[PDB]
Amino acid sequence: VQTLRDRARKNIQEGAVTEGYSADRQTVLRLLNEALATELVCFLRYKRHYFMATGLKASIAAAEFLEHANQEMQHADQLAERIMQLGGEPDFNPRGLEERSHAEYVEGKTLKDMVTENLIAERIAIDSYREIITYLGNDDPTTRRIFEEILAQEEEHADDMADILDDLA
Amino acid sequence: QTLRDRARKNIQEGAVTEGYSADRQTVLRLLNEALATELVCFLRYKRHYFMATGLKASIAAAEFLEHANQEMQHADQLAERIMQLGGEPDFNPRGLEERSHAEYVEGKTLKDMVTENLIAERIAIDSYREIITYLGNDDPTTRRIFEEILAQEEEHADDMADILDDLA
Amino acid sequence: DVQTLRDRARKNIQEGAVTEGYSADRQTVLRLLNEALATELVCFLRYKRHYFMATGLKASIAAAEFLEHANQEMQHADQLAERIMQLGGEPDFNPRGLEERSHAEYVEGKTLKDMVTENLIAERIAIDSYREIITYLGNDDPTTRRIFEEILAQEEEHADDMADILDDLA
Amino acid sequence: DVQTLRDRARKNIQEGAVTEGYSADRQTVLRLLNEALATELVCFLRYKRHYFMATGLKASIAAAEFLEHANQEMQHADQLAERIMQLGGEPDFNPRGLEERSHAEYVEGKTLKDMVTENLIAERIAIDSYREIITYLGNDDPTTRRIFEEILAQEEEHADDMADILDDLA
Amino acid sequence: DVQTLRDRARKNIQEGAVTEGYSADRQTVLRLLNEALATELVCFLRYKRHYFMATGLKASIAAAEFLEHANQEMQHADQLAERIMQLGGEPDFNPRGLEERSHAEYVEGKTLKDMVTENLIAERIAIDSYREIITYLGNDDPTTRRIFEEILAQEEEHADDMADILDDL
Amino acid sequence: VQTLRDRARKNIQEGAVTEGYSADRQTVLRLLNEALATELVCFLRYKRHYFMATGLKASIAAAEFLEHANQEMQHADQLAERIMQLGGEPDFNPRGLEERSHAEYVEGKTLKDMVTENLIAERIAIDSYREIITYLGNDDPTTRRIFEEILAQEEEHADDMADILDDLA
Amino acid sequence: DVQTLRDRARKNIQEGAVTEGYSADRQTVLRLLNEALATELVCFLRYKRHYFMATGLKASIAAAEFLEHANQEMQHADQLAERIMQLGGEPDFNPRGLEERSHAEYVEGKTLKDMVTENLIAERIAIDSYREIITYLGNDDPTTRRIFEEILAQEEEHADDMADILDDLA
Amino acid sequence: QTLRDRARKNIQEGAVTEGYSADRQTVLRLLNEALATELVCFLRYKRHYFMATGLKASIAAAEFLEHANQEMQHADQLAERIMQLGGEPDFNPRGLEERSHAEYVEGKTLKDMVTENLIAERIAIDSYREIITYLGNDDPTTRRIFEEILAQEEEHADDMADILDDLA
Amino acid sequence: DVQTLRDRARKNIQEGAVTEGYSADRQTVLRLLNEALATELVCFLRYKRHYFMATGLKASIAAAEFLEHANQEMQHADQLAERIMQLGGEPDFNPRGLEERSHAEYVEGKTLKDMVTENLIAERIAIDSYREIITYLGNDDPTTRRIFEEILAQEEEHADDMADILDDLA
Amino acid sequence: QLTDVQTLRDRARKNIQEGAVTEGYSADRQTVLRLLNEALATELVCFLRYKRHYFMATGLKASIAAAEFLEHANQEMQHADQLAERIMQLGGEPDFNPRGLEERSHAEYVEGKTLKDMVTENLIAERIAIDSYREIITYLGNDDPTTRRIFEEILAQEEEHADDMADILDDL
Amino acid sequence: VQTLRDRARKNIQEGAVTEGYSADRQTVLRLLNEALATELVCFLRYKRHYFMATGLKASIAAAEFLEHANQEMQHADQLAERIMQLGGEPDFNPRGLEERSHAEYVEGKTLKDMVTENLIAERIAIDSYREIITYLGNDDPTTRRIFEEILAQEEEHADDMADILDDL
Amino acid sequence: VQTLRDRARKNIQEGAVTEGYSADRQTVLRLLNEALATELVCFLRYKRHYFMATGLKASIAAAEFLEHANQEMQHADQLAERIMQLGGEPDFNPRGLEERSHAEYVEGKTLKDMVTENLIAERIAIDSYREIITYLGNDDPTTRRIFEEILAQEEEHADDMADILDDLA
Ligand SMILES: [Fe+2]
Ligand SMILES: [Fe+2]
Ligand SMILES: [Fe+2]
Ligand SMILES: [Fe+2]
Ligand SMILES: [Fe+2]
Ligand SMILES: [Fe+2]
Ligand SMILES: [Fe+2]
Ligand SMILES: [Fe+2]
Ligand SMILES: [Fe+2]
Ligand SMILES: [Fe+2]
Ligand SMILES: [Fe+2]
Ligand SMILES: [Fe+2]
Ligand SMILES: [Fe+2]
Ligand SMILES: [Fe+2]
Ligand SMILES: [Fe+2]
Ligand SMILES: [Fe+2]
């Protein structure tokens, strides 16, 4: 009765983080920020390919590139919001961004170059977030669900890029 | 540089990465069986929607149509995943019922119609529960598709049972 | 009195939309409506199959048309079933024997040219079938005639849309 | 062949939509449009009466249909009045003698079966009435024919909807 | 009996909407579609001119009708060009000789009554032209017939709207 | 306690009509149906005028006529709904409709005729509904508010028609 | 002459909407608003319960009305709480003693006829309560009177809607 | 035919019928004084809206703008009625403040701005309460306008007082 | 093999969404669903009280969060009640004993800091309460688990939003 | 370091509270503010005049003018808002005081008796604003693009209002 | 000061054209009508290309053709509106339309033909409108802004067509 | 005549850039890319401040921080679109982003810190883009108008940030 309340009153400023939070909060925060860097890098890369993919066939890829780009930023916003709830700071610094990220920014010369670099990044993110989802287990459903939702989106991005690549050269 | 090499190996496989620990072949078979089930349930509900005329029946007819269209959304969801996992979705009407866990049943009465839909929903619920168990933690993206469909079928079952209890 | 218009309407009142003035062969029009319904359901399934399988840069353009066509087909299916019910029939959504009732076929195709060609064939079959139905109806059933005349126009668009693609292929 | 198309159009220019090529009997087409208009106004009033009076769980389903029908009837009224004006007539909205001009009646009914049955009778009267008008017009006035053909298709739907209800009652 | 339906469809398959059953004179139907297209383009330009020139209190009322008509005329143009393409023709948007191909003329007018009358004349020319076309088509080409029936009905509205204004002048 | 509920269960099928309803229900119902007849008549008269008022200036009146007609029907619906709540039957019968109504259906020959006839009807309704509002007093707020809302609308309809009539012949 | 209108406005300025001219008994009006607020909150909970429990074909129609009423009750609750704040009070949303404060009861009902009857009883209690409040206010507080007059008209509708259902039942 | 004769006499008076029992001339005077008040209050609120910058103040600034546009809606309501009753609405900025029950006051601080708006609302509340009493049952349509405006001013007064209590 | 899947579904058919394969303790899941329902109804009432009472410049920002939270609480209430029905229970909206059933309390608060603190305490009680329920369900009831996982995530947001405010206060 | 780019930033830190007004602002801030406020007064007067004409223009033909009057009135207020917004960005105070509003405004409030009066009075005001704002645009030159663009956008609207009113007046 | 108004009263019927209008109005009107013809011609050419560009790749260009066509008409409307404000008459006559225009109507046979002809026309318009913008200088801000808004639109159209042509 | 067409055909692949383009294309591209980097940096800084500014008062600034962030990205898109039209490549590389930009990414500790850094950045951009507008003169209206439109937005951002700082400093 009053013990339910006393548990909640202890360390109240910790907010979303309760007596029941069983995950390794600092390590989760580290992973959230690595993912955030990946999303920002993927956002900048896709935006680049979008502007550069001109032409008839390429304009189709350009549309997918832009759609992907803005989804990446949605993933970034989702992750930063969680970083804040779990007592961290989201790192939007462009300095060293690529070093924190699992993906690279690669301009590419051809369209096949562009698509391949995006496909490579998605497959890196897929396996990375699969590992994080496994690592979280049942200790942090709310964070686990963020990565599960991002994962499902990345799997779509991978298929969308691979579908294009098969038609190229 | 090995993360990049892991990703470059079998790049044409797309969403299916080295870390995909499920039996891709078996998941594809289950996805197509679900797809057939959803198309069959769509056709049955669409039949019942048109045939359920009257004062009281027209209320059931509305639910029939809502379910039919939800079934088609499930079909699209499953087919999309079949493609991401490197399969082919089988929309062939020939042998459609043999592939499906459900049946197409016209019914003579409205109680017939509701009962046949209720039976189909309960077949799907237990079938998809088993698939979700089979997937476990190997394919979250597919597991989440079936979990979302499952929740809908549970709604469809309650809606049909709620009606059936009021009938003759 | 003018009580004769009312007496006409009261006779066989449960027949609903079908009045004394309905001059068509109701049983046959219902047969044609159900054959048309089967054709649309098949065409819907074929187009959806092609939509999911047509991946790539060029093909994704075709896939969009395939999906647009698919849903137009189901709209036709709904129009026809609605009319079947108004004329006192039962619409047959049974997938068993669906192809046997249909003027069209379900064909997966291997290439994109295969998919486009098969859809073009189905449309040209439907166009000529529905022209024949429209003629059979004559002035006996304006409401049913108008459904097929409207579907016909959609099919001519689908045929032109698929042919326009096929000319650019291989 | 240019100045003769123009001279054709300049003659009786005040006739508006009604050109030399208008092969129908304008005076009679106007009579039929105004009878149709009275029928639609009457059917609107009857349905509105039934809408307000049909209370209860089961009745409210019919009442919803009564209202949809009522408002479709007024749409038909506007469509017909609009055409009357294009053909140089005057639409008669006068409530005095409205029923005598109409093919339908205003009938309150006591029961829901009464109300549904009376609406079903009126829809079936309109169907055959408008079928005859469509035949009378033939190819002489496509624009007026298409109005009646569009109204007819709606009346057939209204008849089916009322009959579908009556089967659950009688 | 199913392979012969398929054989009919394969013969001349590139002709698209035009099937073995198409019983109209395709070449002549196309000529009529192109004459109608010119009529609509001419009527569009004339109405647009009258719209801009019809200033004042009362005239602004006619000007609104002029603009609504102009844009309906272009919709008619679009319908006809779409049909020209389905039947294997070419829609002629060439401004050179546009008036010669058209049943109508471009006429500036000095007064508002000038403008309204010229528009009324054009609508009455189109009405009788399209009635003749609809008759020529008969039951041979429902899809084209329905286009002209739909355009005709709009032209009758335009004719009545212009005549209703002219009666006040 | 048990009397608040006992007052409400007694005569429960009388619905909105409670023990506290202090108005002369039968008379309120009579007035509601007379008002309903008036609105139906005014609806038909305005619709007649709307279709017949063609021309440059007349089309401006035609638009006001249509707005008025459709407001009249809203009033008809408002009143019929209230008749049902108070235990009556709304009379939509076209036979003898004018005999029940305070206003008349008048085709009019000229536009000034049409405007004048509408203005006369609005001023009849205004004075009728003011008397009903006074008659109701505080005995039936819900019904009173219906008439106060209709009255305000009729005052607008009257001002709109008089504004037109001042500019005429 | 402008300095006295301003001086009246400066006297007790923090009282806000409540001016020197407010002629009602602020304390008592606040009591009635809070009693009404409890009534609406209880009615919201009752209707919500009935909405979820009324399953079946015919019953689902009542469930739709139950939900609509439920949410209209909460709009009334908000309207009343908004006014309580303007008159310098505190709106009591405490679930403890909510029924003791409310003019209506929460009653689960066993049957649909039960549910409808209990809702119908509550509406008729509210009607007579709010009519009495409207009389008590007189011309002293138009802004509050208008809240109750608007709620009253809504309750008369809810009462009629429930009674219309009850007549068709058992 | 007597109802018709009543309506035909003085037909150009429009909404004002034989049964209009209010003092039309005096009602027009009050509508125009109220109109002036609303225009003045609109300008003052707009002034405060632009001048209330900062973290806290921007919250008040949003309220200032909302109030401002509501004031103009009232001006529109009042002018519409002035026309229906056969008058002329006075939008002249010369002497606008003399006709208005409220003042235009710039204020130096935010507390100044809030206090001045609160003073104006309480002036209008009591002014319109008096007008509603004067009308009684003689002019329902006009009475309802003032009753609707009055309720809005009470909200504005409560909203401003709610801000003032938190300030200084 | 088709008649055995079908026989499974006919056994206990009236149970609806609850199939032979449902491996949870339906009785207990329903108990927890109803305790959650009470918690959300109480949290809704508390937040609504705070919304209306939190006046002022800074406080109005909190008031907005209070209202957004309140309506999210009611959405949770509806989700939970819907599930109670599917599992064959009855959702308890009775205000009598509502607080005894709820894991949270209704607390008026005197200051804004009071209000924020009480809301924050409530969210943290809910967070840990629903985490325990998610554990209890395991893999036995995905559909119910997902409801709680979705609610949990919202409560974590509500906790962060209230704590973010409290850090700036007094 | 190497006070390079560090110079762009040191320019920005100086007088930071001056906000939009930077070291690069080459216009006479004091004078631009006077002009913005005169324009603001002009628009408020034009709004009140047009609103007056809207309510008084009853009749068949007049109601068409009444519609134009109302569209114009609300555009005038949009202009007033645009100008007041700029006054704040440049560190001024926008004067909404109705006392002396006309003395500050380039236009007049004129009731007019007839519709022809109303149309003419609005037409005169537009032509005053057109030439006033042309002069202001010229005075600004290239010193304040953001303020110039406000006046250029208002100017184009006033030219439309002028043409709209003249088109009506020709028929009277 | 009473002179501000007398300036505005002189030649009042000229409307937007005031004493301060320093441009050569007759010449501005000539340029506006030449631009109008250019837009009308470009509109017809684009529509022709839209209907004729069938196929997979071509349908992409066809969509751009239609967007451009309708933008061309928006420009035509902008220019005609300005002709009226400045006291001219807009010439929509199809006879001699091409002679008045800086562009041509060219059907083209291939898609490369169509795209090239559009690109050529856009570059003609760009340099024409740059010259007009220069001729206007500061004498007519309102007309100058119309051409600058169109110019930027034409630069987009040129880039869009060149982007397509590079792939052929 | 035939020379307008020949002028347009020369260097046709240059697209928007015609013979009449009198600006230094190479330099305009350099300036556009410096602005592009500035906007990307300002976007990241504002997003960081948005997530970190929690509390009652701080949430007001956070809302503005977010509105600014998204306006900055709109500016980035405008600038990149023009870079492509003038035949350049837009540089979205996070590597060296700050070195190319007139602005910096600065986390700040306090809200006063965040607001001040945003205010400084806007004032740098304001004066930088004013200079670019002068450099363009009348040689490139389309680009000048882009910067003139961005400038007006930056002036708003500066006023909005300064309005906040006055309440803090
Ligand atoms: Fe991705
Ligand atoms: Fe289902
Ligand atoms: Fe098709
Ligand atoms: Fe009808
Ligand atoms: Fe009907
Ligand atoms: Fe046409
Ligand atoms: Fe036309
Ligand atoms: Fe009226
Ligand atoms: Fe209620
Ligand atoms: Fe106020
Ligand atoms: Fe909750
Ligand atoms: Fe919560
Ligand atoms: Fe203006
Ligand atoms: Fe162009
Ligand atoms: Fe920027
Ligand atoms: Fe900025």
Author numbering:
A (entry chain J), F (entry chain H), L (entry chain G): 9 to 177
B (entry chain L), H (entry chain C): 10 to 177
C (entry chain I), D (entry chain E), G (entry chain D), I (entry chain K): 8 to 177
E (entry chain F): 8 to 176
J (entry chain B): 5 to 176
K (entry chain A): 9 to 176
Manuscript excerpt for this entry:
Protein purification in the presence of MgSO4 enabled isolation of dodecameric DpsL in high yield. The protein was used to screen crystallization conditions leading to the formation of prismatic crystals from the Salt Rx HT screen condition F9 (800 mM lithium sulfate, 100 mM Tris pH 8.5). X-ray diffraction from these crystals, followed by structure solution and refinement produced the model termed Pa DpsL-dd (2.9 Å resolution), which contains 12 molecules (a dodecamer) in the asymmetric unit, 33 sulfate ions and 24 Fe ions. The sulfate ions are in the 3-fold pores and near sites containing R13, R33, and R103. Each of the subunits exhibit a Dps fold identical to that depicted in Figure 2A, except that the position of N-terminal residues D8–S30 is made evident in the 12-mer structure by well-defined electron density. Consequently, the structure of the dodecamer corroborated that each of the subunits in Pa DpsL exhibit a characteristic Dps fold that harbors a ferroxidase center typical of bacterioferritin. Sulfate site 1 is located next to each N-terminal extension, where the electrostatic interactions between SO4 2- and the side chains of Arg13 and Arg17 stabilize the two-turn helix observed in the N-terminal extension. As is typical of the Dps quaternary structure, each of the two three-fold pores along a three-fold axis has a different microenvironment, thus resulting in two types of three-fold pores, termed here A and B. Each of the type-A three-fold pores, which are formed by residues near the turn separating α1 and α2 contain a SO4 2- (site 3), which interacts electrostatically with the three Lys65 residues at the pore.
We report the biochemical, structural, and functional characterization of the protein coded by gene PA4880 in the P. aeruginosa PAO1 genome. Our structural work shows that the product of gene PA4880 is a protein that adopts the Dps subunit fold, which oligomerizes into a 12-mer quaternary structure. Unlike Dps, however, the ferroxidase di-iron centers and iron coordinating ligands are buried within each subunit, in a manner identical to that observed in the ferroxidase center of P. aeruginosa bacterioferritin. The ferroxidase centers in Pa DpsL catalyze the oxidation of Fe2+ utilizing O2 or H2O2 as oxidant, and the resultant Fe3+ is compartmentalized in the interior cavity.
